[PDB]
Amino acid sequence: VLSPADKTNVKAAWGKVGAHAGEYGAEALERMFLSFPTTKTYFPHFDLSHGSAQVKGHGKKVADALTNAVAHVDDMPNALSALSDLHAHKLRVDPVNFKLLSHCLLVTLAAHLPAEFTPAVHASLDKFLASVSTVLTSKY
Amino acid sequence: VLSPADKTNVKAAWGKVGAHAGEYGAEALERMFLSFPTTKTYFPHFDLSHGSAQVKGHGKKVADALTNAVAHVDDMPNALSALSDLHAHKLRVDPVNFKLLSHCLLVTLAAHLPAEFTPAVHASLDKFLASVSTVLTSKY
Amino acid sequence: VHLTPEEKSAVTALWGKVNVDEVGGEALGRLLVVYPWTQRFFESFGDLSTPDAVMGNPKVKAHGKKVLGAFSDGLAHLDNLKGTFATLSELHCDKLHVDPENFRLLGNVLVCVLAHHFGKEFTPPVQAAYQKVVAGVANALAH
Amino acid sequence: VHLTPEEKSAVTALWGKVNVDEVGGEALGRLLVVYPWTQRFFESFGDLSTPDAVMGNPKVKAHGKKVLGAFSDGLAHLDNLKGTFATLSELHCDKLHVDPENFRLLGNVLVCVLAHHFGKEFTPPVQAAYQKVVAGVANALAH
Ligand code: HEM
Ligand code: HEM
Ligand code: HEM
Ligand code: HEM
């Protein structure tokens, strides 16, 4: 469960992320693939090399989904229903991989926004990403 | 996130549990203390022997909390605000211990209600106990 | 896994009354139902949509029999779990890419299945002994 | 921990540029803030209510220095982590009753702190090498 303070923290952090969302998501996906190779088994049709156009496009899609989730934080299960159906019913992704991707997103945000990554913002983003992972993994 | 199907399954299972809730909770606490001794550190003032009145009373309290959570399944986050305050801000319990107690409750229900413990009911109760644990571990 | 003589005697006595075909498939099917992300490994089995279809799958029953055979082999070598499950650990870590948390989940599901089957005689001490047994088995597979 | 020579060279070069006194304290404080249940083990450190009070705690800073010293000792003995972290594993398991997942949590927080401090220097390959290092360290403490 998210508090209003952490909700405001996440909103401000992703608002200042802004237009670099696609690059940040692509870098997070690249970090996940490099440091947790078992996550590569979910993308057997993808080109998982550095600078891949497929990885860049998927990172842009993930970043857009995260922006939508931020804009609809109070109704996440109803805003991420399509992604929940995709990840839970069709892809059947292990939630451990969601944890790994959330950590890689946190690492990317820390590396690209040193000033905004205060401990409070780090905790708020951790809780926000945990909530997002919960909805996508759950089937309802 | 829970669905109407597993919500109804949990409601029916707890209705079948009925008045044996106190003894079921006491037995679940005894199982958790016996099989996961690290959980005993959260009760340093308790007498954790077999058949203890303190453990019986705490099991009754846990069972009543679970009953009210079932009664307020759609509004659990604010229906369990006092318990979230107690466990998250004051006691600071690791969510691993909530996982262990949920497993022990599932084992107790399996042992005491064989016919009612279908795979669907098992999955429904697992998901319901995961959500109750998340509300009581979340700090909002 | 270090067990007391009483715990070992209780574990062996309870395992003696286990039906190998029924308990193994039931545990595997309950795993596939309660944790639906585990059907990604068993898509090759066939229809796994409804709980009744998961629990009525001959391939699920046969694989549960194999899993319980592995569990019994581990029980017979409680002092050599790491060496007993070396080949299975290699298979699950390299060729199947199974997360180590799923081993703990399956062990807990098996404990729930044993409680379901035995009822009152699945005492908290017996459950504790089986809990540390399955913990050791899962730690061997994760290695 | 198995690392390539290039990965080991990269890990060591970043580690030399690491300010131990700040990095260890920041990692410990961020762990205590992001995962508030970890303050149960450190309630003896004084005021840990707000994040600013957690990060301004001399006890937290000193303990983070000790933790990062242990991390450096493990880094120098990457081939003998299990034997190096035997006393610490005993202390954390038998006396402190710390769950093994908290070790992985602290490792991830340390990786995030390193990324925060180094920025572009924390490339994905360096992060992968450090992830292997911290995973190996966490397992040795868990043993
Ligand atoms: C916060 C976490 C995540 C978010 C916001 C997210 C979001 C998305 C989005 C927006 C898509 C595009 C769907 C489409 O274009 O049809 C997608 C697809 C996909 N996701 Fe995720 N995802 C997350 C986590 C994960 C993780 C951790 C994995 C695997 C380890 C994963 C595996 C996939 C796969 C395989 C696809 C299919 C893409 C394709 O086939 O081109 N997702 N996800
Ligand atoms: C999982 C579902 C749980 C429920 C429904 C629950 C519910 C409750 C209730 C109703 C109380 C009594 C509140 C009061 O007396 O004012 C309580 C107290 C307490 N709970 Fe829980 N609890 C759960 C899990 C846990 C776990 C897993 C632990 C530790 C491993 C724990 C540790 C405690 C402690 C230490 C107390 C204080 C007891 C006392 O002061 O006498 N709880 N809980
Ligand atoms: C935790 C204790 C476990 C035991 C004792 C066990 C035992 C076994 C054994 C003996 C085999 C060999 C089957 C054969 O050679 O045909 C096997 C294969 C396999 N295991 Fe496990 N297993 C465990 C956990 C898991 C879990 C949790 C999963 C998935 C979530 C899994 C996925 C698989 C798969 C996909 C196969 C291959 C099946 C096939 O090729 O038909 N295992 N396991
Ligand atoms: C990679 C992970 C970790 C490492 C390398 C590490 C290392 C250390 C070191 C070097 C000490 C000092 C021992 C001494 O001075 O004799 C220590 C003590 C301690 N550790 Fe850790 N630790 C880790 C994880 C954790 C975590 C995650 C927690 C809590 C959630 C924890 C709780 C404690 C406590 C409470 C002490 C004693 C502090 C005191 O008594 O003031 N440790 N650890």
Query: Nearest 5°: CA angle at A70, between A69 and A74?
Result: 80
Quick one: which atom of ligand 1 is closest to the CA of A105? 1
Radius of gyration of chain D (CA): 15
Residue D7 CB contacts under 8 Å (≥ 6 apart), including other chains: D125, D128, D129, D132
Q: Which two tokens stand for residue A124?
A: 């708020």
3-class state of residue D11 by DSSP: helix
CB atoms within 10 A of CB B112: 18
Q: Which two tokens stand for residue C113?
A: 């299945």
Closest CA to C19 of C81, C64, C59: C64
Domain range annotation of chain C? 1-143
- Strands (E) in B13-139, as ranges, are none
The shortest CB-CB distance from A111 to any of D30, D119, D125 is to D119
Q: In this structure, are residues A139 and C36 in contact, taking their beta carbons and an 8 Å threshold?
A: yes
Question: Which residue's structure tokens are 């450090």?
Answer: D130
Q: Which two tokens stand for residue C26?
A: 């039931």
Determine the distance separating the centroid of ligand 4 and the alpha carbon of A112, expressed in angstroms: 30
d(CA D15, CA D111): 12
**Residue B7 one-letter amino acid:** K
A50: left (phi over 0), alpha (psi -120 to 50) or beta: beta
Domain count, chain B: 1
D18 burial (CB, 10 Å; 0-12 / 13-18 / 19+) is: middle
- Phi and psi torsions of B136, nearest 5°: -80, -20
What chain A residue is nearest to B132 in terms of C-alpha separation? A1
The residue whose C-alpha atom lies closest to atom 32 belonging to ligand 3 is: C41
Question: Which residue's structure tokens are 């982590």?
Answer: D81
* Ligand 3 contacts CB of residue C84 (under 6 A): no
C-alpha distance across the termini of chain A, in Å: 18
Residue A55 CB contacts under 8 Å (≥ 6 apart), including other chains: A26, A29, A30, A33, A46, A47, A48, A49
Residue B87 labelled as part of a binding site? yes
d(CA C32, CA C38): 6
Residue B29 CB contacts under 8 Å (≥ 6 apart), including other chains: B55, B58, B59, B62, B101, B104
Closest CA to A102 of A81, A56, A58, A133: A133
Q: Which two tokens stand for residue D26?
A: 């920041």
B82: left (phi over 0), alpha (psi -120 to 50) or beta: alpha
The answer to whether residue B116 neighbours chain C at the CB level (below 8 Å) is: no
Radius of gyration of chain C (CA): 15
CATH for D1-143 is 1.10.490.10
What chain A residue is nearest to B84 in terms of C-alpha separation? A1
- Classify residue D120 by its DSSP letter: G
3-class state of residue B52 by DSSP: coil
In this structure, the dihedral spanned by the alpha carbons of residues A20, A26, A31 and A33, taken in order and rounded to 10 degrees, is 170
Question: Which residue's structure tokens are 């993994």?
Answer: A137
Q: Which domain holds residue B5?
A: 1-140
d(CA D2, CA A44): 26
The shortest CB-CB distance from A92 to any of C39, C97, C102 is to C39
In angstroms, what separates the C-alpha of B16 from chain D's closest C-alpha?
Answer: 35
The residue whose C-alpha atom lies closest to atom 23 belonging to ligand 4 is: D103
The answer to whether residue B82 neighbours chain C at the CB level (below 8 Å) is: no
**Residue A124 one-letter amino acid:** S
Residue C65 CA: which ligand is closest?
A: 3
The answer to whether residue B130 neighbours chain C at the CB level (below 8 Å) is: no
B96: left (phi over 0), alpha (psi -120 to 50) or beta: alpha
d(CA B122, CA C4): 31
Instruction: Please count the residue pairs, one from chain A and one from chain B, whose beta carbons lie less than 8 angstroms apart.
Output: 20
d(CA B24, CA B40): 19
B139 to A3: CB separation less than 8 angstroms, yes or no? yes
Instruction: Please count the residue pairs, one from chain B and one from chain D, whose beta carbons lie less than 8 angstroms apart.
Output: 18
- Phi and psi torsions of A51, nearest 5°: 70, 20
3-class state of residue D46 by DSSP: coil
User: How far from chain centre, in Å, is Cα C39?
Assistant: 16
Sign of CA pseudo-dihedral A58, A64, A70, A75? negative
CB atoms within 10 A of CB C63: 18
d(CA D29, CA D51): 8
Give the HSE-up count for residue A70: Cα atoms under 13 Å, Cβ half-sphere. 21
D93 burial (CB, 10 Å; 0-12 / 13-18 / 19+) is: middle
d(CA D90, CA C4): 22
Question: Which residue's structure tokens are 């699945």?
Answer: C122
Q: In this structure, are residues B78 and B138 in contact, taking their beta carbons and an 8 Å threshold?
A: no
Q: Please name the residue ranges forming H helices in chain B.
A: 4-17, 21-35, 53-71, 76-79, 81-84, 95-112, 119-137
B103 to C115: CB separation less than 8 angstroms, yes or no? no
Q: What is the largest CA-CA distance in chain C?
A: 44
Give the HSE-up count for residue B65: Cα atoms under 13 Å, Cβ half-sphere. 20
d(CA B117, CA B7): 15
The chains in contact with chain C, meaning 3 or more Cβ pairs closer than 8 Å, are A, B
Radius of gyration of chain B (CA): 14
C-alpha separations of D119 from A87, A110, B54, D55, D115 in Å? 31, 8, 54, 21, 6
C-alpha distance across the termini of chain D, in Å: 15
User: How far from chain centre, in Å, is Cα C92?
Assistant: 14
Question: Which residue's structure tokens are 């057997």?
Answer: A44
Question: Which residue's structure tokens are 């919960």?
Answer: A134
**Residue B121 one-letter amino acid:** V
The shortest CB-CB distance from A35 to any of D34, D51, D127 is to D127
Q: In this structure, are residues C101 and C127 in contact, taking their beta carbons and an 8 Å threshold?
A: no
B95 to D37: CB separation less than 8 angstroms, yes or no? yes
Determine the distance separating the centroid of ligand 4 and the alpha carbon of D67, expressed in angstroms: 6
CATH for A82: 1.10.490.10
d(CA A88, CA C53): 19
Angle between helices B119-137 and C20-34 (to 10 degrees): 50
CB atoms within 10 A of CB A45: 5
d(CA D101, CA D85): 16
Q: In this structure, are residues A6 and A106 in contact, taking their beta carbons and an 8 Å threshold?
A: no
Determine the distance separating the centroid of ligand 3 and the alpha carbon of B69, expressed in angstroms: 37
Q: In this structure, are residues B17 and B109 in contact, taking their beta carbons and an 8 Å threshold?
A: yes
Radius of gyration of chain A (CA): 14
User: How far from chain centre, in Å, is Cα C77?
Assistant: 15
Q: In this structure, are residues B132 and B80 in contact, taking their beta carbons and an 8 Å threshold?
A: yes
Closest CA to D36 of B114, A23, C113, B91: B91
- Classify residue A49 by its DSSP letter: S
Sequential DSSP letters for chain C: ----HHHHHHHHHHHHT--HHHHHHHHHHHHHHHSGGGGGT-GGG---SSHHHHHT-HHHHHHHHHHHHHHHHHHTTGGGHHHHTHHHHHIIIIIS---HHHHHHHHHHHHHHHHHHHGGGS-HHHHHHHHHHHHHHHHHHH-
C51 to B35: CB separation less than 8 angstroms, yes or no? no
Q: In this structure, are residues A21 and A64 in contact, taking their beta carbons and an 8 Å threshold?
A: yes
Structure resolution, Å: 2.9
D40 to B92: CB separation less than 8 angstroms, yes or no? yes
Residue B41 CB contacts under 8 Å (≥ 6 apart), including other chains: D97
Question: Which residue's structure tokens are 């926000």?
Answer: A128
- Classify residue D48 by its DSSP letter: -
Q: In this structure, are residues C20 and C75 in contact, taking their beta carbons and an 8 Å threshold?
A: no
Closest CA to C135 of C98, C110, C99: C110
- Chain B CB contacts of A124 below 8 Å: none
Sign of CA pseudo-dihedral B81, B83, B86, B88? negative
Give which of D32, D33, D37 to mutate to test B binding, by max B Cβ within 10 Å.
Answer: D37
Question: Which residue's structure tokens are 């003995």?
Answer: D77
Q: In this structure, are residues A59 and A27 in contact, taking their beta carbons and an 8 Å threshold?
A: yes
d(CA A48, CA A90): 21
d(CA C102, CA C59): 19
Residue C1 labelled as part of a binding site? yes
The shortest CB-CB distance from D37 to any of B38, B41, B92 is to B92
3-class state of residue B83 by DSSP: helix
The shortest CB-CB distance from D127 to any of A107, A114, A122 is to A107
Sequential DSSP letters for D51-104: HHHHHT-HHHHHHHHHHHHHHHHHHHTGGGHHHHTHHHHHIIIIIS---HHHHH
Quick one: which atom of ligand 3 is closest to the CA of C44? 41
d(CA B58, CA D64): 38
A96 to C101: CB separation less than 8 angstroms, yes or no? yes
Q: In this structure, are residues C11 and C126 in contact, taking their beta carbons and an 8 Å threshold?
A: yes
CB atoms within 10 A of CB D132: 18
**Residue B58 one-letter amino acid:** H
